[model samples]
Target: KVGFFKRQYKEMMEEANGQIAPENGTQTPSPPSEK
Candidate 1:
């Protein structure tokens, strides 16, 4: 149902919850180093 961009968004949004976000509105940028 979801592909790359969608997947990215999914993870992004998911991470936005609780600790992954930190409420500071800043993210670690993919966390996974893309190739």
Candidate 2:
């Protein structure tokens, strides 16, 4: 009952996902929706 439900799992999950930067950057060269 402690293996899966532990603080380490929370940190692991965050580190796994938090490693990637957020996608709130400038869309300078991005094309607009012409569709």
Candidate 3:
């Protein structure tokens, strides 16, 4: 369904950019163990 595809798309995008940003001042707070 379209809804399912939308969720999957967001998850994929997040996974792609998940590790590429952390100390660059992203709005999402980093985990305690990011180093």
What's the CA error at residue 20 for candidate 1, in Å? 6.4
lDDT of 1 by residue, 1-35 (tens): 45886878766666674354465345335555651
Compared with the true structure, what per-residue lDDT tens digits does model 2 show for residues 1-35?
A: 79775777665655555435453233222447732
Measured by TM-score, the strongest candidate is: 3
- Against the reference, the lDDT scores of all candidates come to 0.57, 0.51, 0.61
What ranking of all candidate models by TM-score puts the best one first? 3, 2, 1
Report, for all candidates in order, the number of backbone clashes.
0, 0, 0
Model with the higher TM-score, candidate 1 or 2: 2
TM-scores, all candidates, are: 0.35, 0.38, 0.42
Tell me the tens digit of each residue's lDDT in model 3 across 1-35: 79986888666656665546662346334578983
Better of 1 and 3 by lDDT: 3
Name the lDDT of candidate 2: 0.51
Instruction: Sort all candidates by lDDT, best to worst.
Output: 3, 1, 2
Sliding window of 10 residues with minimal summed lDDT for model 3:
21-30
